Amino acid sequence: GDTLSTIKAQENQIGNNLSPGDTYPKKGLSPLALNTMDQFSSRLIPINYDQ
Amino acid sequence: EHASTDQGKTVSRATTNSKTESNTAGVSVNVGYQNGFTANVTTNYSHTTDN
Numbered sequence: 858g859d860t861l862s863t864i865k866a867q868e869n870q871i872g873n874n875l876s877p878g879d880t881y882p883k884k885g886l887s888p889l890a891l892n893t894m895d896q897f898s899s900r901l902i903p904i905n906y907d908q
Numbered sequence: 909e910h911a912s913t914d915q916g917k918t919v920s921r922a923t924t925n926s927k928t929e930s931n932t933a934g935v936s937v938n939v940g941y942q943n944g945f946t947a948n949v950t951t952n953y954s955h956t957t958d959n
Contacts (some may be wrong), residue, residue, distance in 0.1 A: 894945050895945065896943075896944035896945065897944060897946065898945065900941055903950065
């Protein structure tokens with residue numbers, strides 16, 4: 858029931874195009890890393906023991 | 909019976925001269941988060957000599 862964390866796409870994770878029925882990255886390409894652990898990223902999302 | 913009474917008196921004097929030679933070597937590894945993900949590795953070595 859609780860929000861672990863709220864994410865917002867960094868300037869390097871902005872998709873230029875998204876046609877209806879398409880995805881970003883496109884089909885066949887590998888998915889995006891949510892954090893990337895870089896000089897731009899936010900801290901990793903923590904979880905308790907209960908969660 | 910035979911009864912005795914001895915009394916003494918000592919005077920001493922000692923001089924020491926020491927000399928030590930120490931060497932040190934260490935590695936410090938740091939990882940953290942500060943407006944982004946950071947990392948450091950420090951390598952130090954020291955030499956002391958006392959008389």
